[PDB]
Each structure stands twice: as C-alpha cells, then as structure tokens.
Design a protein around this motif. Structure first.
Motif, PDB file in Angstrom:
ATOM      1  N   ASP A   1       0.829  -1.219   0.000  1.00  0.00           N
ATOM      2  CA  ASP A   1       0.000   0.000   0.000  1.00  0.00           C
ATOM      3  C   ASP A   1       0.864   1.271   0.000  1.00  0.00           C
ATOM      4  N   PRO A   2       1.579   1.592  -1.083  1.00  0.00           N
ATOM      5  CA  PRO A   2       2.432   2.763  -1.132  1.00  0.00           C
ATOM      6  C   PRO A   2       1.599   4.037  -1.036  1.00  0.00           C
ATOM      7  N   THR A   4      -0.679   6.569   1.920  1.00  0.00           N
ATOM      8  CA  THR A   4      -1.950   6.400   2.592  1.00  0.00           C
ATOM      9  C   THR A   4      -3.068   7.118   1.846  1.00  0.00           C
ATOM     10  N   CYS A   5      -4.303   6.832   2.249  1.00  0.00           N
ATOM     11  CA  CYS A   5      -5.464   7.639   1.920  1.00  0.00           C
ATOM     12  C   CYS A   5      -5.183   9.120   2.171  1.00  0.00           C
ATOM     13  N   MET A  16      -4.552   8.790  -7.470  1.00  0.00           N
ATOM     14  CA  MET A  16      -4.188   7.860  -6.415  1.00  0.00           C
ATOM     15  C   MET A  16      -5.214   7.856  -5.277  1.00  0.00           C
ATOM     16  N   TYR A  19      -6.347   4.734  -2.616  1.00  0.00           N
ATOM     17  CA  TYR A  19      -6.079   4.391  -1.227  1.00  0.00           C
ATOM     18  C   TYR A  19      -7.309   4.639  -0.358  1.00  0.00           C
ATOM     19  N   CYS A  20      -7.972   5.772  -0.556  1.00  0.00           N
ATOM     20  CA  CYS A  20      -9.224   6.096   0.105  1.00  0.00           C
ATOM     21  C   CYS A  20     -10.349   5.310  -0.561  1.00  0.00           C
ATOM     22  N   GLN A  21     -11.508   5.208   0.088  1.00  0.00           N
ATOM     23  CA  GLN A  21     -12.671   4.500  -0.432  1.00  0.00           C
ATOM     24  C   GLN A  21     -13.948   5.237  -0.030  1.00  0.00           C
ATOM     25  N   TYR A  25     -12.986   8.350  -0.604  1.00  0.00           N
ATOM     26  CA  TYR A  25     -12.705   8.502  -2.033  1.00  0.00           C
ATOM     27  C   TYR A  25     -13.242   9.859  -2.469  1.00  0.00           C
TER      28      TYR A  25
END
Length: 40
Positions: A1-2, A4-5, A16, A19-21, A25
């Motif tokens: 997981d390069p 973070t959110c 990118m 990472y968040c959802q 997101y």
C-alpha cells in the motif's frame, strides 16, 4: 500500500485516491481535484 489515503489527498493526486474509499474517495477527490489544491 504505497502512500496512505491521506497521502493521496496530501499529494493532490486524485488519481491515487484509490487508497481512500467510499466517502473518503469522494473526499480525497473533492480536495485533490479542487482547483485551489494547495493554491495560496
């Protein structure tokens, strides 16, 4: 997981947001895709 959110936001890299959802997101979107993204 390069990166973070956060880091997706912090980079301004909407691309990118992966990472968040869900809410995070669309939140990271709303920051990164913001015209004034780190614009003084």
């Amino acid at each position: 997981d390069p990166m973070t959110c956060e880091q997706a936001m912090a980079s301004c890299e909407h691309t990118m947001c992966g990472y968040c959802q869900g809410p995070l997101y669309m939140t990271c979107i709303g920051i990164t895709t913001d015209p004034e993204c780190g614009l003084p």
